[model samples]
Target: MESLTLQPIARVDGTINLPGSKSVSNRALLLAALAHGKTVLTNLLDSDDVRHMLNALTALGVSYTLSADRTRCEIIGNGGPLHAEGALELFLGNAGIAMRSLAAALCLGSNDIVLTGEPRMKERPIGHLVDALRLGGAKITYLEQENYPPLRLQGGFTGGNVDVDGSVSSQFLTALLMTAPLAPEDTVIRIKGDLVSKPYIDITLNLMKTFGVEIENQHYQQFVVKGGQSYQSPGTYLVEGDASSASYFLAAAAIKGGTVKVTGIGRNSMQGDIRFADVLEKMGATICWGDDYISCTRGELNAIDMDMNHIPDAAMTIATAALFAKGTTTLRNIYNWRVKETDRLFAMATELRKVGAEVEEGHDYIRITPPEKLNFAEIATYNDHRMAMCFSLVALSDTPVTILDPKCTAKTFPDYFEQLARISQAA
Candidate 1:
């Protein structure tokens, strides 16, 4: 329970029916709860992140039913903005999507709500979202540190022109876009800086359109939403499989030289992380892409130097995959990694070095050179799901890999280790 030491894996070959995306699941669930009719969401991600959203919905008086497996959820929509009387506290426990999205939604009605999260979540900067909300008259008090969580929301926002800094986290912009339509007046949102993770905003817009709310997207710079528009449920929403989680398996196949097929996501996927497969293909992996599946086989790996701002989470897999490459691999424009579950930039550099790789940790980039052979090391997860899953690829080398607190993957992929084990063949 404390640690899982993976013996060297000679090959990894199997079919993975990918889990639902945490990003799409939470977005759809919140949109479903805000819609005008009962909505059925299938293939929902069953994870701590989704649970946080679901539990917060329960606390906010949104009614929903879950199947025994917890992947099928039928939600009785609030028909509009969520309303809660008196004072209530919501502990979101490190689910960034839940904390950020709910922060905006809770401001739309007459409610005295406190939005807090895990210690790391509290450490995550939310002032950008809060500041943008305040521009529209949302009364939010920073309950703890400045620019961080433990937010006190005394609902006061209706709608207006708002400027949000998009340089940090796109979730702030996403939160604003989702809540903009419910306002009494049309809302105009302007970006204050270059938006990182640009495709994530596309995902938000797509989901909003699915729920029958349309926004005028001005080339990712500004957005306009008409007020008094209610979300119309499409009745049944199916969440796409998590493209980020698929990175590990796909990377494994590229490293270990056995075909690995990952189902549930492909070329038509809405997630930006799916582009990670393109990164793999450039690294000399044999890839077969389908409408809803992607398979990878090994090739003579080569290093790459590129900007990875678009696929921040999936880029972590590439960092580890660099260990199997023929030369130095450089990932640039990933400063947001420092603000994730942990200071991932720092953590990643430390861990990669432990495994005998040469790493250059930069302010907004990381460069890695694979060692001639790997060194067995105990990799810390930092309670970040991606960290645990990404480092698991080290097992593909001749060295054994010890993952500390492997359960950290429960945040997004609860059975990640099991899924990885099913595909691995011991050397």
Candidate 2:
């Protein structure tokens, strides 16, 4: 089906077992492949983005076995950067994490590799990462465009002192940080602009620490990692449930709920999106926190004007959630939204307007006002998974919502609508 229409939902009350984190899944898969010995990854997300990484790993000759469900994976480590002979091409689709991270890791070996993606992926700029990788003596050439994907990488990275622009996307910095320890010389990375999504860097640092590599972070502006280091297998790593995916269910409950319990991530969750609960709480939702679960119950919702740079992905949920609020809500300092799966800022504003919300789209921010009554409109997903999941909240209202390209959620949360149905009570 091209689109899926969600009927009006009167209330949502149930428990959800979320899939594993996309960020953690890709990072762990890469680290485990580079570590010594073997590593077992449990609860890995079975989604398009992760499958892209797994397929790329297979192409690079990284040996790993997957369970029937494709969630449990055991990988035999190479104990260093991956290598391949002759020229090879990897079509990564639109998986940003896999593209950026692999772009750096592949530079550590002397191999001829071409990295290309879907049409939209070519539009997403990779110059910032390519520029930084070039600083470390990485041989990368843009095959088609100057600043985008379709890159030809011939390994020559010797990581020493390098600087990366931090304003566009934090994933570039993350790619650099992950590959720094494997360089021949000590690596020092300096930030060129105000960092965005700083919490994602924290996620990278924490995971690196878990894999037995340490980076000296000088605040958020700089990082230093000793070279000639190898990651040690943790033997077994359990991927935490995706907190970004949790936002949809949590917001559903908060908008109109008896209660909704989301398991697999909780108070101790390392993902930055976990802080989205704080935003919901500030908006008068009652939230219950536990070690491996967080529940939400309906409350009197109010508008909020806040900077939400830290949780860019989860913040989209807030945009749709604002429809149920009493006043205008503003999300600020999210310029990076323009560079995600789609131009999220404009795409979100366009779709919100379709549903009768008054929206002010800005370069780096958005303001939304609740409508007296929402329209039953067709919401275009733009092949961006988050857009589809975020707009699902419209069903909490009396109006039904049609989500175009609903299958786009396969990028991260493949069974999103099915899972939503498990907890939804139709009006």
Candidate 3:
């Protein structure tokens, strides 16, 4: 739970079963809690993010049972908005998704609740979401800085047309959409500008439909949801394996592979991160996809320039994988990465330099050129899960990469290092 040293590995080859997606698992838990009937959720991720949501629901009196391994859940619904007669406070531990989604969803109930999170969570902005929710008749007051978290809410949602800025994080828009159908009046949401990390919205819409709420999406620019609608449990819902979590293994294969097959995501997957496999292919890896899995093999890796705004999380894999590339790799339009668990852009650049890569960390882009020889650098995780996971790939270069706070992966994939160990072949 402290630090880990990933020794250089000669080759990686095997099959892996990915954990459930944090994005989908948390959203599904909340949706099922608000729906009208019992719901069975399988393949759920057992991590800090999902646990935060699960605990929040429990605090608000939503009952659910968990499997021994913590990967399956059965939730009992209350047929409407979550409520607690007295005042309640929910602490979402550094989970931006839970903080945002629950902030919007709680507005539909009838009680006062204070939403707070870890110190870093308070620094993250929630003003864009608060502005939109207030327009829809939600009484939300910021308890801390003008725009950041630590919010006090008096539950109520009388929906109407609202404009939300989407440039920062897509989680804000997603929170609004998930809670819109239950508003007292029909809701219309128009985008402020080009939405960043836009594919996350697709997952929100898809899950809303699956839970029996229909949303009229007008080509990513606008969405309309009728009022008085309710979510009906689908009886059983299965979560897809996390696609973002698969990036490391995929990149592992591309770096020093005997071929690695990752199960749980494929052609029909709704997550935008699945497209990361295509990006690897573009990097000259031999990539193949089946109905529910993808396999990647080592090849003559090459660098590429791409607008990675669509796949911000998985794009971090590209940053580290650039170490194995033949030329410079540039990833553009990822400004939102700054507002995540850490100032990822700056952190990545600082750490990459320590490992001997020529890195240009820009405001919205990063250019990385492989070094002639990589050093065994101590990569700081910044308590950011992606940072720890991404830097692990440095081990493939015959230099043992030391990761500080490797346990940060518990936010999404708690067994990340364990899984990597399963198929790792010592150099």
Alpha-carbon error at 403 in model 1, in Å? 0.5
Off by over 4 Å in 2: none
Tens digit per residue, CA lDDT, model 1, 1-427: 5999999899999999999999999999999999989999999999999999999999988999999989999999989888776668888999998999999989996789888988899899999999999999899888789999898899888899999999999999999999989989889999997999998998999999999988998888889889899998889888899999999999999999689999999989999999999999999999999999999998878999999999999999999999999899999999999998999999999999999999999999999998999999999889999889999999998889999999889999999999999999764
Q: Which predicted model would earn the best lDDT?
A: 2
lDDT: worst 10-residue window of model 3: 78-87
Q: What is the TM-score of each candidate against the true structure?
A: 0.99, 0.99, 0.98
Candidate 2 minimal-lDDT segment of 10 residues: 83-92
User: Order of candidates by lDDT, top first?
Assistant: 2, 1, 3
Which one wins by lDDT: 2 or 3?
2
Give model 3's TM-score versus the native structure.
Answer: 0.98
Against the hidden true structure, what lDDT does model 3 obtain?
A: 0.92
